[PDB]
Amino acid sequence: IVHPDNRWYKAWTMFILIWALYSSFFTPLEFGFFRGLPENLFILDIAGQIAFLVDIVLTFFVAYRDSRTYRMIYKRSSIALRYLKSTFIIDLLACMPWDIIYKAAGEKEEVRYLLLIRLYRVHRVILFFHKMEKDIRINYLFTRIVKLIFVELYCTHTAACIFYYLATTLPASQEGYTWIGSLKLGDYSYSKFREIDLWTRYTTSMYFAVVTMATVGYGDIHAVNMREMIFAMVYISFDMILGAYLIGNMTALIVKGSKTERFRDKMADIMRYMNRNKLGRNIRGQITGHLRLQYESSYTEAAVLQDIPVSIRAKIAQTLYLPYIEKVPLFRGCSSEFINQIVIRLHEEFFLPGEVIMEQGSVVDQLYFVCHGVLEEIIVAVLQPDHSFGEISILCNIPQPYTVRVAELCRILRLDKQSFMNILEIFFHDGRRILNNLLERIKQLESDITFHISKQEAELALKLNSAAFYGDLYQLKSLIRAGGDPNKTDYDGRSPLHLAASRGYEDITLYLIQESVDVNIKDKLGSTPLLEA
Amino acid sequence: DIRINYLFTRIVKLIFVELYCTHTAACIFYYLATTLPASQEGYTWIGSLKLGDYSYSKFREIDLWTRYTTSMYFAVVTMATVGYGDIHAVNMREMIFAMVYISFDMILGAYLIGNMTALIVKGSKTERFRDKMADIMRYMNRNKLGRNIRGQITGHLRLQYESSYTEAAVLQDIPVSIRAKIAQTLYLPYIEKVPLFRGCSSEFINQIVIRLHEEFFLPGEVIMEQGSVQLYFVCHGVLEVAVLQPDHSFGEISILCNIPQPYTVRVAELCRILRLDKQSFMNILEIFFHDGRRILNNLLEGKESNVRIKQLESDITFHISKQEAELALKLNSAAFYGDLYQLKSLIRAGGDPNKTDYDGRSPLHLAASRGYEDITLYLIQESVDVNIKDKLGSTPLLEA
Amino acid sequence: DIRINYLFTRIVKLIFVELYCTHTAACIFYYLATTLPASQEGYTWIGSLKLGDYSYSKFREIDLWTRYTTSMYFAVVTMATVGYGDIHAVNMREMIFAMVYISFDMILGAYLIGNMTALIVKGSKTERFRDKMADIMRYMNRNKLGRNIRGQITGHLRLQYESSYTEAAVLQDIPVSIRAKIAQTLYLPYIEKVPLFRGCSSEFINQIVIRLHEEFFLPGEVIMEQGSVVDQLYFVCHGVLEEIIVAVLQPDHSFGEISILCNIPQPYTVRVAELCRILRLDKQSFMNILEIFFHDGRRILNNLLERIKQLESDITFHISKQEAELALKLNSAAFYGDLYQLKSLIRAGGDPNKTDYDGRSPLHLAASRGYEDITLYLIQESVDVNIKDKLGSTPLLEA
């Protein structure tokens, strides 16, 4: 047993597809135009059957496809059960020779009708389109269009061979009552109609079928007798439904949309939005510039990635943004846990050349990491990739001293002020390294950074004491599970038990017992919490 | 009829109508040829017709099946707008009929094309699923990331695709009377055996099963965020610091204790979750005062294996005591007006005769305050303290 | 015009334009045959024409009515793109006109198909109904619902198929303020005729019409069962119902009001006899409205009388107890110092100056527990300070 993915059996399937195309396009030709398949084609007829014969026994080696949803069962009894119950009888009958049998039973025309069973193997070509339709590299709607064209052009080929057969089913003495026997083009007569250099006998028949299939209509070639009118009615009626089916799938391809159609809709809203607000002409040149930027070089296609869950998208950000961040001088030696908390909350933006991101004296509200392109700071400096700018303003609360100018098309990762400080506060140890690395006003910033981390420990103690003083149980609850130690004292020294015992708040006293806060803590006065009660 | 494909039954209906109008037009077109005398056969579409070799000299006694196919052959060629010119109208009465039939077929012919295009454009449910996949796959190769996360992305959207049968259904159209009966046959077994509602009133559980809203969450999704402020029930599967067994409710302590959930809930596998609105639970529990007290009583008893309940025991013990004291407050109110009907129900539903309110009072004091002997012996037979002392030193014998 | 569909009107306009251009092109085409001398009529499309036996030789005195039809017959065949070849252009000036007429009609022909598709793509009643049944059948199969219930859900969906209903998900765009007036226009006349609301105030009744819902029930269905707890109140507006046969329900009546008031389980089974239109009201909404209209609440109980004595006594006892109960709730909030808890029951509750059954102003409890903050709030309401309980004590005596 072999699974249908061996990459060698799969190459065998692509080899039998050539025979399927050949034997499906040649069976109508042999049935209609030929009356015995002369010996020039003897080898090809025999070779075609043995190629399909080795496949009729190799089908048992294939295991299975699926039982209910997905189950490849490799069992001899299971594999053969589906084969003999679905299409084995037809496959065997089609591979059995019929040309030699026709000539071995005298000349019986009724035995040549069995030769049309070979038309079933064209279904193998159709299954190829279905298999290729599930492929994601090529659009499936476009594949469905090609399938309908092949079917329509194959039925035209089959109808041309059948139509010529209806002309040969009358005696040669009555050839004047056939569509081709009585035909007369410009100078040609088509008198004998049976020795007309077949290659110019098939084109005439095919020329009739293509004109009828496209519903053009000339009248130079048309049905005359009763048995050719009936076939024309069923071929025309069948093609009318098939013709309207192609148009339906052609519309569905267009109705999906395009880049130009989506871009044109966005500009309609932006132009309407800017007109009603009377925006300046300079700003209108920037908003319209960014929309054309995303027109070509297709963007992330927003409103689609939002279906992705945040948990999965969290891993996506690490795969993409991590290599660029690690190279910045600011984050040299930082812990991996701290850096990972930054990659999750980053956003990607593009800026055209000549644009301005920051102005001199402006308050910085975002932190930008340069990942692509080049920027020039105003010329007093040049910004290279794997760098960050604006970090001076956001740390020392200094207004931005320099203007950053975009020099070439650049990709920039931005971080908000609120998100940055929340991450920085938790990683207190990492925060000290950032200030130290930035040094390598500098002394004042370094002193402030060391003073900022020193004051925050004392400030949280005051917040807890204030909440305990006013008896707000819920206010102090948030700063206990994710805040500081309630046992600590402020600058003067004031345990929450002292204030609670001074104001006679019995309820808050119970909670402090649960935290096992020490009772005999003394301030810089010699007093005890029991002394206030 | 849902069992029959809609595209199939629209083609057949339109084909039958178009093939029937063609059949009728063929019979009418031959009639216009017989309205002229036999001497003027040469001015008819069929009397002046000569195919390959046949003459159609008289177009009478011509073996009607031979005389009908040629008329039908002309009609179906113009129906499909092919056009041959071997058969065509010659005189006025056939030209006029041809104009009113060709123009009629043009409107009907364009109606078939416009009817089949609309059904092709309006694709099936599975058709729109594959369209969304192409955008994700195309974006996936734009970055060329790893293979481990590709399986999670494909599995996530497929899981919600197959579980969206209850997602925004049309059940709101059904009257609530029918819809209430549906909920009592689906969710009732699960809400009956959850340990939280053990020993609860039958009427209470009927008012809580109606408001359920089932939901399916893919594995790895965040049901709730840690440190953030809807009751949830589990039916099958496992939930994730801790693992939630089936038939166990989480988030009950958060609502009751007014504390945000400290752990983020992440789905370990494909599980069915029934959600109840947080505001709905508070409003529902308010009506059933007797049943609500038994809820946290069962929650308090659970402080044996779970560690979260043990460290929250003090706060929980306050709520039950506060609610129990409120029950005693109503007990004295009922005895004040001497309506013995309410006294029996309250004392039977866990009420105690030796229950004191905040201000030291007891039902015995209210019983003898108004001189109601009917309730006096009821508490005496209930083994109550005759000499119960209040804050102000007013014994039941004193104020009487 | 809104009476007739605009897409269908647009279809008729295109047909008129196409059939008018065909008429104009037929008159122009014959003009191109008369712009040549009579001696050269053999080079024209009609001069050289020869049908079955007719010759069209002179073609200039040919009984015009049979000269226009043969020219219109050419134009209609070309317009529909059929093509016969019996009539066709021959000279140079008729080929050029045929090229511009055929090319112009090709664009116009494809324009008709586009508008024909847009008419179909809008949808239909059958198409929308078929989509709903697909979800319901899928929903019921996965939950393994009983065969009896499946007969009811499918019945209501088919009920709204014909006699088109409100077609919900479109009226939601209407603002609630406007929709409030719509309810008073429709549901108000039906409510006023019920015996229960005889003599009720217009303000009370208006608060009921706003929060009603519309439902339909097929014959043979059951709304209430014996011994069941009633959770909805129904007003009969159309059809006839039979209560089980012990009674018959007529329009402009209400049933189930006994259960919702005395907390008694439903004693009778209500069965639908004919197609009925029913307005329903929830239990929670009904009680909230009734509590505010205390005066109207007494009238409803009195009108219902005309177990009855017990229900009447309970109704009079229910309105008596609620005044005392709200006093206890305020005192409990003041005892535990929950400022926000008592805030909600002051602006939309009872008078804080009132006392409970024993008599205890909230100032007494506040002064007993030493809650300074709550004391400021009571000053804002100007609550009397010298209120005494049935003990001789004062609020200052507890402090």
Side-chain angles (χ1 to χ4, degrees), chain A residues 439 450-451 453-457:
Chain A
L439 298 177
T450 57
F451 195 80
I453 58 180
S454 180
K455 69 162 71 67
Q456 53 86 17
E457 183 177 356

Tab-separated table of all heavy atoms in Angstrom, chain A residues 439-457, unseen atoms left out:
chain	number	residue	atom	x	y	z
A	439	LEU	N	23.766	57.288	29.015
A	439	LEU	CA	24.859	58.207	29.316
A	439	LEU	C	26.050	57.975	28.395
A	439	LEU	O	26.662	58.931	27.905
A	439	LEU	CB	25.279	58.063	30.779
A	439	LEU	CG	24.219	58.400	31.829
A	439	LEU	CD1	24.758	58.147	33.228
A	439	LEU	CD2	23.756	59.842	31.681
A	440	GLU	N	26.393	56.715	28.146
A	440	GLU	CA	27.522	56.384	27.286
A	440	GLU	C	27.176	56.605	25.816
A	440	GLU	O	26.015	56.815	25.465
A	440	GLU	CB	27.962	54.936	27.512
A	441	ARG	N	23.522	68.406	31.311
A	441	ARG	CA	22.189	67.821	31.227
A	441	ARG	C	22.238	66.313	31.446
A	441	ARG	O	21.305	65.728	31.996
A	441	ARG	CB	21.549	68.137	29.874
A	442	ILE	N	23.333	65.690	31.003
A	442	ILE	CA	23.493	64.250	31.184
A	442	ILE	C	23.561	63.903	32.665
A	442	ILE	O	22.928	62.945	33.124
A	442	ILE	CB	24.739	63.751	30.428
A	443	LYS	N	24.334	64.672	33.436
A	443	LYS	CA	24.408	64.439	34.875
A	443	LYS	C	23.064	64.700	35.544
A	443	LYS	O	22.650	63.949	36.435
A	443	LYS	CB	25.496	65.316	35.493
A	444	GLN	N	22.372	65.766	35.131
A	444	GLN	CA	21.054	66.053	35.688
A	444	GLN	C	20.062	64.947	35.353
A	444	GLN	O	19.273	64.530	36.209
A	444	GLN	CB	20.550	67.401	35.175
A	445	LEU	N	20.084	64.461	34.109
A	445	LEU	CA	19.206	63.359	33.730
A	445	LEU	C	19.557	62.089	34.496
A	445	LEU	O	18.665	61.355	34.939
A	445	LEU	CB	19.285	63.118	32.223
A	446	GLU	N	20.854	61.810	34.655
A	446	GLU	CA	21.270	60.643	35.424
A	446	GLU	C	20.863	60.772	36.886
A	446	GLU	O	20.391	59.805	37.495
A	446	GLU	CB	22.781	60.447	35.304
A	447	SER	N	21.043	61.961	37.467
A	447	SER	CA	20.618	62.179	38.846
A	447	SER	C	19.106	62.069	38.979
A	447	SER	O	18.600	61.489	39.948
A	447	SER	CB	21.103	63.545	39.334
A	448	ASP	N	18.365	62.622	38.014
A	448	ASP	CA	16.909	62.532	38.053
A	448	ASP	C	16.440	61.089	37.926
A	448	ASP	O	15.494	60.674	38.604
A	448	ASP	CB	16.300	63.393	36.946
A	449	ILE	N	17.088	60.310	37.056
A	449	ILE	CA	16.715	58.908	36.888
A	449	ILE	C	16.935	58.138	38.183
A	449	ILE	O	16.085	57.345	38.605
A	449	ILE	CB	17.493	58.282	35.717
A	450	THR	N	18.081	58.357	38.834
A	450	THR	CA	18.322	57.731	40.129
A	450	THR	C	17.388	58.284	41.198
A	450	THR	O	17.024	57.564	42.135
A	450	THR	CB	19.779	57.922	40.549
A	450	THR	OG1	20.089	59.321	40.586
A	450	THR	CG2	20.711	57.225	39.568
A	451	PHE	N	17.000	59.554	41.082
A	451	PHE	CA	16.049	60.133	42.023
A	451	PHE	C	14.624	59.672	41.746
A	451	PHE	O	13.823	59.552	42.680
A	451	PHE	CB	16.132	61.660	41.978
A	451	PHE	CG	15.471	62.341	43.142
A	451	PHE	CD1	16.117	62.435	44.363
A	451	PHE	CD2	14.209	62.897	43.013
A	451	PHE	CE1	15.515	63.063	45.436
A	451	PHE	CE2	13.601	63.527	44.082
A	451	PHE	CZ	14.255	63.611	45.295
A	452	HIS	N	14.290	59.416	40.477
A	452	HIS	CA	12.947	58.953	40.140
A	452	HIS	C	12.669	57.573	40.725
A	452	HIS	O	11.582	57.326	41.259
A	452	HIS	CB	12.761	58.940	38.624
A	453	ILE	N	13.636	56.656	40.628
A	453	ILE	CA	13.444	55.322	41.178
A	453	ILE	C	13.493	55.330	42.699
A	453	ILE	O	12.925	54.438	43.339
A	453	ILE	CB	14.487	54.343	40.606
A	453	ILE	CG1	15.905	54.826	40.916
A	453	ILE	CG2	14.294	54.175	39.106
A	453	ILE	CD1	16.990	53.912	40.392
A	454	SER	N	14.166	56.313	43.299
A	454	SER	CA	14.214	56.392	44.755
A	454	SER	C	12.901	56.914	45.327
A	454	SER	O	12.447	56.446	46.378
A	454	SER	CB	15.380	57.277	45.195
A	454	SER	OG	15.445	57.371	46.607
A	455	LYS	N	12.275	57.881	44.651
A	455	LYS	CA	11.070	58.500	45.190
A	455	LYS	C	9.845	57.599	45.068
A	455	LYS	O	8.967	57.644	45.936
A	455	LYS	CB	10.802	59.840	44.497
A	455	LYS	CG	10.390	59.730	43.035
A	455	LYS	CD	9.736	61.011	42.541
A	455	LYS	CE	10.743	62.138	42.401
A	455	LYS	NZ	11.718	61.867	41.309
A	456	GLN	N	9.772	56.775	44.018
A	456	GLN	CA	8.563	55.994	43.773
A	456	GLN	C	8.292	54.998	44.894
A	456	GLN	O	7.130	54.676	45.168
A	456	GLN	CB	8.663	55.278	42.424
A	456	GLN	CG	9.920	54.442	42.233
A	456	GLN	CD	9.786	53.035	42.787
A	456	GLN	OE1	8.681	52.560	43.047
A	456	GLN	NE2	10.917	52.363	42.972
A	457	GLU	N	9.343	54.497	45.548
A	457	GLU	CA	9.145	53.587	46.671
A	457	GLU	C	8.504	54.302	47.854
A	457	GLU	O	7.674	53.722	48.563
A	457	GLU	CB	10.477	52.957	47.075
A	457	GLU	CG	10.367	51.944	48.202
A	457	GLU	CD	11.693	51.285	48.523
A	457	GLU	OE1	12.686	51.568	47.820
A	457	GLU	OE2	11.743	50.482	49.479
